[PDB]
Design an enzyme around this catalytic site. Structure first.
Site, PDB file in Angstrom:
ATOM      1  N   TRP A 167      -9.074   6.441  -0.529  1.00 53.15           N
ATOM      2  CA  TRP A 167      -9.609   6.997  -1.746  1.00 53.15           C
ATOM      3  C   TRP A 167      -8.500   6.856  -2.779  1.00 53.15           C
ATOM      4  O   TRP A 167      -7.380   6.018  -2.692  1.00 53.15           O
ATOM      5  CB  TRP A 167      -9.509   8.494  -1.601  1.00 53.15           C
ATOM      6  CG  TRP A 167      -8.183   9.257  -0.840  1.00 53.15           C
ATOM      7  CD1 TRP A 167      -7.119   9.239  -1.492  1.00 53.15           C
ATOM      8  CD2 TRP A 167      -7.965   9.287   0.434  1.00 53.15           C
ATOM      9  NE1 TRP A 167      -5.984   9.797  -0.495  1.00 53.15           N
ATOM     10  CE2 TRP A 167      -6.713   9.737   0.602  1.00 53.15           C
ATOM     11  CE3 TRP A 167      -8.940   9.364   1.596  1.00 53.15           C
ATOM     12  CZ2 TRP A 167      -6.140  10.222   1.821  1.00 53.15           C
ATOM     13  CZ3 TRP A 167      -8.433   9.792   2.749  1.00 53.15           C
ATOM     14  CH2 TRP A 167      -7.133  10.206   2.900  1.00 53.15           C
ATOM     15  N   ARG A 178       0.162   4.485   2.876  1.00 53.80           N
ATOM     16  CA  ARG A 178       0.206   4.460   4.441  1.00 53.80           C
ATOM     17  C   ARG A 178       0.559   5.341   5.253  1.00 53.80           C
ATOM     18  O   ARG A 178       0.390   5.315   6.395  1.00 53.80           O
ATOM     19  CB  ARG A 178       0.936   3.105   4.651  1.00 53.80           C
ATOM     20  CG  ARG A 178       0.495   1.672   4.444  1.00 53.80           C
ATOM     21  CD  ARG A 178       1.658   0.856   4.604  1.00 53.80           C
ATOM     22  NE  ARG A 178       2.392   0.733   3.717  1.00 53.80           N
ATOM     23  CZ  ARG A 178       3.848  -0.101   3.520  1.00 53.80           C
ATOM     24  NH1 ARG A 178       3.986  -0.596   4.789  1.00 53.80           N
ATOM     25  NH2 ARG A 178       4.405  -0.029   2.363  1.00 53.80           N
ATOM     26  N   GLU A 208      -4.895   3.968 -10.924  1.00 51.16           N
ATOM     27  CA  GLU A 208      -5.679   2.871 -10.492  1.00 51.16           C
ATOM     28  C   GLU A 208      -6.945   2.876 -11.444  1.00 51.16           C
ATOM     29  O   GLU A 208      -7.184   1.773 -11.885  1.00 51.16           O
ATOM     30  CB  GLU A 208      -6.172   2.929  -8.913  1.00 51.16           C
ATOM     31  CG  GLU A 208      -5.134   2.528  -7.842  1.00 51.16           C
ATOM     32  CD  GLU A 208      -5.756   2.433  -6.541  1.00 51.16           C
ATOM     33  OE1 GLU A 208      -6.012   1.249  -6.302  1.00 51.16           O
ATOM     34  OE2 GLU A 208      -5.890   3.450  -6.084  1.00 51.16           O
ATOM     35  N   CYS A 233       0.833  -1.188  -0.035  1.00 43.12           N
ATOM     36  CA  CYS A 233      -0.006  -0.020   0.047  1.00 43.12           C
ATOM     37  C   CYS A 233       0.965   1.348   0.183  1.00 43.12           C
ATOM     38  O   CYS A 233       1.719   1.476   1.034  1.00 43.12           O
ATOM     39  CB  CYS A 233      -1.103   0.090   1.351  1.00 43.12           C
ATOM     40  SG  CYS A 233      -2.021   1.524   1.341  1.00 43.12           S
TER      41      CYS A 233
END
Ligand code: HEM
Ligand code: HEM
Ligand code: XFJ
Ligand code: XFJ
Ligand code: XFJ
Ligand code: XFJ
Ligand code: MTL
Ligand code: CL
Ligand code: CL
Ligand code: ZN
Ligand code: ZN
Ligand code: ZN
Lengths: 411, 407
Positions: free
Chosen positions: B278, B109, B283, B106
């Site tokens: 979000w 973070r 992506e 991720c």
């Protein structure tokens, strides 16, 4: 054991058995993956198994495994090692060895070409002047007036480690970098340390933005000597853009011949510390890395300014837009000048065909995803969704420390 | 044993000691690196509970205290008696936040400590799960000002009474094989869509149909629920310069919400733990729109731009890619729906990683996932060495439940 790799775009699954032949270590353990770490005098005892492993591979490749000729060669090498503590490769073995080091180079996206490698045997070389002549000849052969041909020149192997042949340059052709008193850099910042060394050794630096460095060559463990590559042998391409007429006035150019000169070639336990090799460029190496890394020529801002992109927020993607146009210009320019270059879509498509072929015929193709995926537009290339297995096969090319850190100056 | 990571852009070297607390296995060995592979009892439970409680009490500066010992004692007695134990609310919240903190894939973070945790351990039925999830969606969405959240349903017991959300994300679009042989909608969701129809969903048969939830409570057969349409915030995609871009009829949903992972805290296993943040713009614009097996819109966009598509070296794919990603960001920003671009996100991650090294001794990170799928080397994570290792509490992949469920 069988290991499976999946392609998440095509669902094609491949099965690796070749990893069983891996010997050397990765840096990883069951507890930690070091896949993104850039860097993760043999005795007789250790040498003969390495020689035998290599000769078995070589004789198998020529369908002569277990023949009298195979057995006789093992015996010959055994006796040479016991008597002289080393051995010499036959020219056939040297060629096979260099081709396989490339075939095995897990970071190389260009390996579809591995069997097409011209090998120049420079094991009779004894002096730095001799090295210079061999290298000029390699440059001329490989450049071929822009119709680039892959090649490697192999200088004498390591003996006691006190007599090494080394090319101190990291690439045969590369541009000088000069740190200024105000902390800015003229030319290529990647090469500041090596440029200072050349100057200290006596090079009269032109102090421009694209000065081809001299060769700094060490033979037989002696102190290195400086030589200038004849300018007429150094093919370069002025960079222009097919639609933006102002692109040429950025004053950019690059050299045609990418030639790595700082790596160590290991074949059958023998160590070739000077083994310069060259191919041709993938466009992103120049347009992304060399031009757009912040610590390299760092041209993104200037390009974006001239395109009049909105540079007030990163979300306009001005950097991305400028990066694509720069890469267009590099490909356009090389193609217009008839200098071999491959775009990242073509190179990665060819790599995937190579990789699949290697799985079928060889049982695997070790590959380092971190390096194989291009540095722009990753996911729209067919390597991004390809799972890969990274492991070390010999013969191999290995990193070695820069020789100024290790060299014993004779005076 | 102590490890150095270098940034090749800035020459800064950081030292990692946190990896020595790593527990789970990576899939790599000394002989082979699997870094690019996507999927590489009472006795067992107490050490895991202890390891976690020790870290918790240390975090609140009460390690070795009476309260620490007493809690360890209480948990031991509870495991010995009941074969499991229940987390305190404080421990549940701490564990959830740390599962995010530990998520090596991720890039987001920096935000880890600002997670809203909804405790749904009192949920007993699939209708109960639906209500909780609607409330999560509404809270997280917050009319476009998105807020990170996780909703945690009851833990696994004997493994025959699992809570599961069958959907991969809370909000996702249906996919439908056409008589054509083509796929309408999102090809990623063809199998799950079929399961929904088989369980009785009346499919609208469009390109962007929000899937119903298939919720499984207490090991029961899953049930179907539709998220209230007014709770699903979507953004029509247009371009600031190209007037024709809107005519592609593209849209996407605002809320990225993973619903298929397992949260492990102190050896306990929360098989239904949907969480949301979000989007980073790539992506949608790179992965969801341009993957060949997804909406695969590159060719159409390039054609509308009238690029030379005869040769790859014109870089027509790259040009269209950038423009699609410009449109995604512009659209979300114009509609005031939170989104982060890949430059901003990766800059933040580097700042986060430096904080984690200095305060925590490391930050596990998976370079293959952290580097954005476009323009990798112009972001500050590309030249950053990362060490990947597994810390708990954690989020884990788990198999899709239809491969597992006995009806
Ligand atoms: C023929 C055309 C070739 C192309 C297009 C090509 C492409 C590339 C690229 C793009 C890289 C990575 C550089 C980066 O990520 O910035 C690379 C690495 C490498 N290639 Fe090739 N290559 C070619 C020929 C060769 C040849 C002839 C050899 C050796 C005989 C070779 C061996 C290697 C090795 C050992 C590396 C890793 C270098 C390092 O660690 O610094 N390649 N190649
Ligand atoms: C708040 C804004 C957030 C951003 C911008 C963000 C960003 C991302 C991105 C870009 C990915 C990889 C997707 C891809 O590469 O295609 C990812 C993966 C992941 N993130 Fe985040 N994230 C956010 C919030 C969260 C939260 C709230 C959690 C959990 C509480 C979380 C846990 C995870 C996990 C476990 C993965 C790996 C998922 C998988 O294996 O499929 N993230 N994140
Ligand atoms: C610390 C460090 C480690 C390592 N193994 N390599 C490097 C140098 C990486 C590197 C940088 N620029 C250029 C190259 C050359 C890559 C390359 C080589 C060849 C033969 C052809 C081609 N098209 N491209 C390699 C640095
Ligand atoms: C000795 C040395 C020092 C330094 N500060 N940087 C370098 C160059 C590092 C470097 C930067 N960009 C590109 C590369 C090429 C290798 C490379 C590295 C990564 C991480 C991905 C990828 N696709 N290729 C290498 C070398
Ligand atoms: C086989 C497989 C394994 C695995 N671990 N994950 C996946 C799913 C990968 C995946 C695909 N689309 C979307 C996501 C969600 C990423 C994500 C999650 C959150 C919470 C916020 C944000 N901005 N982005 C994850 C598949
Ligand atoms: C179950 C499943 C099956 C399938 N065939 N594909 C998928 C999606 C695979 C997928 C494709 N692109 C992207 C991702 C997101 C994770 C991801 C993966 C990689 C390699 C890099 C990166 N930056 N992010 C996942 C999932
Ligand atoms: O200025 C010297 C550098 O070019 C040199 O250290 C290289 O980075 C090194 O040889 C890696 O290729
Ligand atoms: Cl780069
Ligand atoms: Cl992707
Ligand atoms: Zn690894
Ligand atoms: Zn770089
Ligand atoms: Zn993808």
């Amino acid at each position: 054991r069988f290991l499976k790799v999946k392609n998440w775009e095509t669902d094609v699954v491949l099965t690796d058995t070749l990893h069983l032949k891996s010997t050397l270590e990765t840096g990883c353990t069951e507890h930690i993956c070091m896949g993104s770490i850039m860097l993760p005098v043999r005795t007789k005892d250790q040498l003969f198994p390495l020689a035998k492993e290599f000769l078995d591979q070589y004789y198998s490749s020529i369908k002569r495994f277990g023949s009298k000729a195979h057995m006789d060669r093992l015996e010959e090498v055994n006796k040479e090692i016991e008597s002289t503590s080393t051995y010499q490769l036959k020219d056939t073995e040297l060629i096979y060895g260099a081709k396989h080091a490339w075939r095995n180079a897990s970071r190389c996206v260009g390996r579809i070409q591995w069997s097409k490698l011209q090998v120049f045997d420079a094991r009779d070389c004894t002096t730095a002047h001799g090295m210079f002549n061999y290298i000029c000849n390699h440059v001329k052969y490989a450049t071929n007036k822009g119709n680039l041909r892959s090649a490697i020149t192999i200088f004498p192997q390591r003996t006691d480690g006190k007599h090494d042949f080394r090319v101190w340059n990291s690439q045969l052709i590369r541009y000088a970098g000069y740190k200024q008193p105000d902390g800015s850099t003229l030319g290529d910042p990647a090469n500041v340390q090596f440029t200072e060394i050349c100057i200290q050794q006596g090079w009269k630096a032109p102090r421009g933005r694209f000065d081809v460095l001299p060769l700094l060559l060490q033979a037989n463990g002696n102190d290195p000597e400086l030589f200038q590559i004849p300018p007429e042998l150094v093919l370069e391409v002025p960079i222009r853009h097919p639609k933006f007429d102002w692109f040429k006035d950025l004053g950019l150019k690059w050299y045609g011949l990418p030639a790595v000169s700082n790596m160590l070639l290991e074949i059958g336990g023998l160590e070739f510390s000077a083994c310069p090799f060259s191919g041709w460029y993938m466009g992103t190496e120049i347009g992304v890395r060399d031009y757009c890394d912040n610590h390299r020529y760092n041209i993104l801002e200037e390009v974006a300014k001239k395109m009049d992109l909105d540079m007030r927020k990163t979300s306009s993607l001005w950097k991305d837009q400028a990066l694509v146009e720069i890469n267009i210009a590099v490909l356009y320019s090389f193609q217009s000048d008839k200098v071999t270059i491959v775009d990242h879509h073509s190179a990665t498509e060819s790599f995937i065909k190579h990789m699949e072929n290697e799985y079928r015929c060889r049982g695997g193709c070790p590959a380092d995803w971190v390096w194989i995926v291009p540095p722009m537009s990753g996911s729209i290339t067919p390597v991004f969704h390809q799972e890969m297995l990274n492991y070390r096969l010999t013969p191999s090319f290995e990193y070695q420390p820069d020789p100024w850190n290790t060299h014993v100056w004779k005076g």
